[PDB]
Structure formats: structure tokens, C-alpha cells
Amino acid sequence: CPLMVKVLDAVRGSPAINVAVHVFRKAADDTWEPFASGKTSESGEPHGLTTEEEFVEGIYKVEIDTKSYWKALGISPFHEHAEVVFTANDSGPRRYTIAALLSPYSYSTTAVVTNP
Amino acid sequence: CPLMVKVLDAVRGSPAINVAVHVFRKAADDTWEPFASGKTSESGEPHGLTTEEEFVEGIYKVEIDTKSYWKALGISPFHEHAEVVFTANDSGPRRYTIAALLSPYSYSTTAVVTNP
Amino acid sequence: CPLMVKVLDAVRGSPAINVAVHVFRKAADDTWEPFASGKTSESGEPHGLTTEEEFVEGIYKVEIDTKSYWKALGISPFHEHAEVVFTANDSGPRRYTIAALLSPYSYSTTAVVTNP
Amino acid sequence: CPLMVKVLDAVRGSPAINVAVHVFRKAADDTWEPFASGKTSESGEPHGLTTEEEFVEGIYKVEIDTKSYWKALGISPFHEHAEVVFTANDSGPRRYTIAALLSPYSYSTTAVVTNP
């Protein structure tokens, strides 16, 4: 998997399960074209989002539906969602892990970029 | 100031100076209408973005131009920018501080919401 | 104030009120000598911890009683406390802000170091 | 492995390699008895720290030698080290992942606690 998304819940100290994750790729005209989508499993990651071949050079956006996640736990959170926007694979293929750590009024995101 | 944005640099342990901050408000048709803009001063905050009166109930987006900030320090960062999207002032006026802590491959954002 | 401590609650989006903060200074024999102590007010900061004069060059430890803070809100947290250990004022006086952002199973701390 | 430590570098967007990790367990008299130690590999984790059997109920301290890590990269960091202190396994065995995200003037730590 060259693109992995890992979501953690800082209130419960657990992976965040059943979080919607959307990936878009910026198109020729600058609109966000849907690229992939998934829901996090028990490990806090969605199932294989893409392959090395399909994951071409470009600008990507990962959106994580944090608001729905909290609401479903009976918590009213601050953010509508969390997004990460980055350029990928512009000096050859890399593997990307986007980690998001969630609290109701805060979140952190970090990228771990390795060689394949 | 009912809307304050505070940007910190985790590499230098300093406020992030000269960072562009944009605020948008979601319009009737769901497009992001420009609402305010500023550049952080030496304290890492832009100059008074709005007033209590203009800061009406609605969905707001704060974008922080993190990529340009790092590039100008000769660092090549991961994110294109950082954004915070939230609903504001829907149960009366509140004061909002959006804090962003920046590193080249990571950032955290938190909201402090108080009464006026 | 050359040493400020700012504690935020990421679950409530508020300053963390009534948090115990302890400061120690490493002594000649390497034991931690009590240096200052306070409880955060409504702004999430303890009252003036020290003066520029008393805040001499040395190794300092700031402990924040996060466990008691959460327990008192009826939450059972992961950490026993949070600590920050750093050398201060070894190239002349600096002003130090230690910011701590708290969730029940996570916390972040950052230092902002400025000239007086 | 019931106790895992994962260290990430937010400046480089990589696992933090060759970081010293120490684990202590609080003893009958309240002194910190050495429990385990390791250095992070290329994945940012030390090699198997303990077993389910040896990892008994008690208060543990994990120290991460962040200062040496940064210094060795020619960076002068703020913190002397990072520590996490917590009670473990007091309602039966759990698996603990302590994640630390490092920048020169900041760090975050989070715990992921699962059932075996």
C-alpha cells in the first residue's frame, strides 16, 4: 500500500473505528476529482486505498470525516472535518502514511514518507 | 477580537512570523466567500481579523499558508497549507482562538472557545 | 514573567483551570529542588512563577498534574502527569512559554523562547 | 509485544532511527527500577521490550532520549528528553503503544491501549 491513513482517538486511547476517509486528486482544471474512499477498520485504517501504479504524481487531498465520527459517539466536536493536502510522487514512488490524532477540539496530522 | 489565529514554529520555538492567513465564510450556495485576510506579526497572529458584529453565525474556513512559510526559510515542507473548518456563533457570540503548531511534516491545530 | 505555562483542554476547547504546576531546578548534586508552584487560573496559566532575577541559568523541570485534572472531571486518564525538562538562560535571559495541550490519552507540549 | 514505542521525526517525516528508549518500573520504595531498554530501528521502534508475563501490573516510566537524537543530527533541541509515566495492566493484560512525535522545540505523545 503506497498510501496509508491511520486515525487515532485521543479521548479513548484507541484507533478511531468507522471513520470515513476520502482521497481526491487535483485535475487538469484544478477541481478535486474523487480518487479513493474508505472507512477505517478496527485498526484505524481504511482498506487498501490505491496501488503504486494508480498513485501517480500529482496533488492529493485526504479528508477525514472527524465531525461524524465524534457525533456518533455522542460528542459535539469543533471541526467539520480534517484535511491533508500534499504533492505526492514527484521524485519517483514513495509510500505515504498520513497519521491523524483526534480530540473533539483539536487534531494533529503527521506524514511519514518512505521509499518503497 | 472575536477571532484570533496564533501560529507557532516547532522547529525554532518561536511564533511563526509573516504567515498568510485567510478566512472564508460559506455562502448561501456553498461557495467559500472571502471573509478576511492577514499576515502574522512578530507575535504569530494576524492583525484584528473581524469584529463581533461582522462575525455572524455561519461556517468558516481558516487557511494558513504553511507551505510558503517553510519554503521562505529554505525548507521543503510536506503540506500545501493547513486549514480549519468550523461552525461559529450558532448559540450566540463566542471568542475563537485557532492555534496552529507547525513542523515541516506535521501540524496540530486546536480551538479555544470562550464567552465574550 | 520570564517563565509562563499555558495549559489547554482539547476535549472542552478551553483553558485547563485549576491544574497544579510545579517547577523544580536541578541542584549541585543532581536532585530536583523545588523552585516554584502554582495552579492555573481561568486563563490556563499559573500566577507569576518567578522573576528574571531568580530565574537563573540551570536545568529546570516543569510538572503538570494532568491526572488529577482529568480525574476531577470524572475522566480516567492515561498519564500520571506531564513533565517538561529543559536547560534555561544559558546564553543570557530568555522568556519561556511552555504550552501543554491535554487529552485523556495524549498530550503535546511546545516551547516558545523569546528575548526579553 | 505488549509494550511498543514508536518514535517519529516531524522535521524529516520519517521514523526516528537510533533513539534510546528506557523503561522503568516503580519499585516498592518508590524508586525507578530499570525495566527494559532499546534503541529504535529503521521503523522507529525498539526491539521487543518485554513479554506479557514480565509486564506485570505497576507504574511504568518510558524515557525517550530526544536530546541526543537531535544533537546527532546537528540540531540543538529544547527538551532534555521526553517521558511518559502511566499505570499499566491493573485490570488485566493490555497491549500498549506509546507514540512520540518529535520536533526540536515540541513533542506529542499518545497512548493506544488495546486488548491482547
Ligand SMILES: C[As](C)(=O)[O-]
Ligand atoms: C462531511 As465531508 C468531509 O464528506 O464533505
Ligand SMILES: C[As](C)(=O)[O-]
Ligand atoms: C496557497 As493558498 C492556501 O493561499 O490557496
Ligand SMILES: C[As](C)(=O)[O-]
Ligand atoms: C502527582 As505529582 C506530578 O505532584 O508527583
Ligand SMILES: C[As](C)(=O)[O-]
Ligand atoms: C539522557 As537520559 C533520558 O538517558 O537520563
Ligand SMILES: [Zn+2]
Ligand atoms: Zn465524507
Ligand SMILES: [Zn+2]
Ligand atoms: Zn475542508
Ligand SMILES: [Zn+2]
Ligand atoms: Zn494564501
Ligand SMILES: [Zn+2]
Ligand atoms: Zn485545503
Ligand SMILES: [Zn+2]
Ligand atoms: Zn502536584
Ligand SMILES: [Zn+2]
Ligand atoms: Zn515524571
Ligand SMILES: [Zn+2]
Ligand atoms: Zn538514555
Ligand SMILES: [Zn+2]
Ligand atoms: Zn524526566
